[PDB]
Amino acid sequence: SHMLRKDTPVLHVDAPFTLHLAQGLLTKDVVSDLYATAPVNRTAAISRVDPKQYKMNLFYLMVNNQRSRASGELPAVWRSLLDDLAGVEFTDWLSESTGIDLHGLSQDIGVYTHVDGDFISVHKDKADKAITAILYLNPEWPTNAGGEFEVHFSGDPDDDHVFRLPPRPGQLLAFPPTDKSWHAVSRVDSGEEITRLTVQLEYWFEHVDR
């Protein structure tokens, strides 16, 4: 559609693992529009806390290339973003950007929110999918509130060698699940009642209604 800029160049990161980064996919005005109309009350709370640990809120706009019940009755701007993210034009851009062609795959689109106390511990995604892409929809993220994408250099949960990237409006991070794809989300520590808004796009190999 008209939302995502299909001409934005990407940063290829060969560093501990393949990682692709883009900024400016959406204007600040559109991200503000999406954030103010965000269907955050449609999320469900999930958490795992015992020896990938996490605590977050989630609901799926699309599972296995099929729009969900929760994807109906959306604000116009969210209807447009879902159309664009599910469309062929964006899959073109993301397939050209990451070097993996994603066209015949089972696509999942979910809306994630992280509030104060939410986190995702160090882990590596499941190997049975081609690409995970994270779209950041916060107009402004405070600088000492956590909620940062963490590039890790090992799976040892005691390791503190980290490279962090804060959310930015219209930013997209995309990476395939490689043996080295260790990543995490630092605990959101704001106190000023802020909400970390993302949309994750998963491209699976088998077409199941998971």
Next chain:
Amino acid sequence: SHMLRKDTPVLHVDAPFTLHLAQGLLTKDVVSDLYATAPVNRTAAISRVDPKQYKMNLFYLMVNNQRSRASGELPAVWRSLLDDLAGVEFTDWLSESTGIDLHGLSQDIGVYTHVDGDFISVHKDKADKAITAILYLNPEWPTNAGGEFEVHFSGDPDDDHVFRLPPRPGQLLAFPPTDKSWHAVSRVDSGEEITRLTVQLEYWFEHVDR
């Protein structure tokens, strides 16, 4: 010395040009110590504004492996940072991190500050040096104040395809001057009287007192 952590891993960026990124070289306590004692009043104002344009403040702690007059009478923490940045242990780390060996080269160390209105336009460094490394010494950089390292995808000054990285305490960016090494520093736009503090390390091939 005891300042810079010689065991921090690096992010290799193969994207539009070779770029290496590291965080946590210094603790937040040391960066705060360096910033509060920063010899910013030893800088000189420089600027070029006509068709690499810039506006900034600068003075050199070291030119051609030789400590300058301005490098004397420094606070103890700045004496230690200069010793560490000029030492063999750090040149080891930076040579291993970037893949270029920097030992027999002519090293320049300068202290740069950018205030409100300061900037560096899109350009590509001179080809007669091996590596430029930028050490960021702001304890906290506000999120909408400019002063960001800009990864550009062409030399056209009308091009607005950019990937930006904000300053972080103890962060280091390092890259060789390749044909594609287009970069810039967005104009500092704070209004709250803030100072962008960096230390640049240049490794030249010829040993001249430039």
